[PDB]
Symmetry: C2
Subunit: 322 residues, 2 copies
């Protein structure tokens, strides 16, 4: 059994007396030392090596990704550091005055990260970013109107790749891809940006400096105040020394890209994975999408894309949920 494998893996590496306290199974020593077991079997299609490689890479930068305590690549098992339970979302739910300082710490992580020498990961080039918006047609539009508007999509993708190519410049940086409050953990005994524990970095890519900042600040699952986004963009620009007009323009086209795709991601979470609650986030996503399409960089694509995708009226939301 898989339980026998887990027990053999733990015994082999000196953790036989540790107990599970219920992919991310909490384990505790007889005296309360903490660790986390990752169970991602190869036979199932999982691979532990990217997690190990990227956790090491981030930690080499004094970023609080988890230490690897033990590894078993062939059986798809790891034992890693437990980064605790103080999720940014929980901290902010309990005390809203922590939002700004927690978001500043996370932006400080990105600033530091973006100064780093990069690993060779697959790149989010303009063509790839454009194609990645296709979920807006194949999942969101399709779930609502019953077709994916193939011709509008091909025309949008072609124009949008050109716009992305025109507005995104500079070397690519490490991008986490799910950089938002729910995947961040507060570690208050640490110093500075090291207080930001990070998980879910394993499918990281190379991409633009604004990519993780958009996910953080336009986070569709939370109501991030406009002043948090404004001030955090200012701070990122001031701290990095990037050209302001260019970063702002890149940020706007990237916000269109990410919100458009997440329309599809959320549509599919509801329609395929039965999670209707993500549909409550669609009006927020749609608003950020529409805002970004009002940026002058998007002028050639805006009117045609808005004609092709249905606004989330109450009947559209219900059809997304049902």
């Amino acid at each position: 059994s898989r339980e026998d494998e887990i027990r053999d893996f733990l015994a082999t590496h000196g953790y036989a007396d540790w107990n599970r306290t219920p992919r991310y199974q909490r384990l505790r020593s007889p005296t309360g030392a903490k660790a986390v077991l990752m169970d991602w079997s190869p036979e199932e299609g999982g691979d532990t090596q990217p997690f190990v490689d990227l956790a090491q890479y981030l930690r080499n930068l004094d970023i609080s990704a988890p230490e690897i305590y033990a590894e078993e690549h062939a059986r798809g098992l790891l034992l890693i550091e437990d980064l605790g339970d103080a999720l940014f979302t929980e901290v902010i739910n309990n005390d809203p005055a922590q939002e700004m300082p927690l978001y500043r710490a996370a932006v400080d992580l990105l600033i530091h990260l973006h100064d780093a020498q990069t690993p060779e990961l697959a790149r989010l080039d303009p063509e790839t970013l454009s194609e990645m918006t296709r979920l807006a047609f194949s999942e969101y539009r399709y779930a609502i109107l019953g077709d994916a508007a193939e011709d509008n999509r091909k025309r949008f993708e072609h124009r949008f790749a050109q716009i992305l190519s025109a507005q995104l410049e500079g070397d690519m940086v490490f991008v986490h891809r799910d950089f938002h409050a729910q995947n961040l953990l507060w570690l208050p005994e640490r110093e500075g940006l090291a207080r930001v524990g990070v998980i879910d970095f394993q499918d990281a890519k190379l991409g633009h400096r604004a990519y993780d900042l958009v996910s953080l600040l336009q986070d569709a699952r939370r109501d991030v105040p406009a002043q948090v986004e404004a001030q955090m963009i200012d701070h990122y620009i001031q701290a990095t020394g990037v050209d302001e007009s260019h970063f702002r323009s890149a940020y706007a086209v990237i916000a269109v890209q990410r919100n458009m795709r997440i329309l599809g991601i959320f549509a599919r979470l509801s329609q395929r994975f039965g999670k209707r609650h993500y549909i409550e986030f669609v009006p927020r996503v749609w608003a950020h999408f529409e805002r970004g399409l009002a940026h002058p960089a998007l002028a050639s694509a805006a009117e045609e894309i808005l004609n092709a995708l249905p606004a989330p009226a109450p009947e559209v939301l219900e059809r997304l949920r049902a």
Copy 2:
């Protein structure tokens, strides 16, 4: 080429601009950051996984084995922490007054290590320890007299396994197996036993508490003063709370075991690997062997083994060197 693989491995993990400054290749960043490349190819028969597993295990105990910065198991490459150049032997050569405090720190490492929950490594049971002395016949005796005294060896091994079984008790501990001053590195910015950097732990096993202490204190490559050995055994006994008479007896039989085997190891280093300088260490090894055979625990084996192995007279040493 292998150089192309190394360069691909470094580039992939963000180290492309690091340069080699000449298995254990020194690498330096453009601003002088340090790391060590391990090149142990599978095609050659090498495996990086035990080094990774055991380095993690030791570091989980706050023992200064090297961090793993990057790994490539399939191609047999690792990038690890550089633990520096302050080898215990160099420190003590320069300043002999450091011998006691450096050896105390190393003994403190073992004390701490032996309190740890163990991994599942192959065990140095009595039969295995006995067989491992056979190099005394197949390499040392053979190099000198032209035969391995098969009958004496079988009789010695049978009796010696019984003696080992009688004198060794308690749970097995992690044993490094090459625990001596040459494989230890001083890290003076660290605290306590963490100042003892350790390398060459990758073929570690489980064995007796005295195993690594014998290699450290009866170190055949150095003249460890009798007072260092005496006081370090006292300190180990006092700090661990082990029964004194039993530890001392275990230490004596283990000293016989390790010195007997190293007669063979050194004979073979000279005869097969052309390193005649190890033969200068044979008189020291022989003296420790003879001392241990005078322990009452060894009484049934002592006279027969001494009759079977030639004393290292000047003509014996020359035949070992030539």
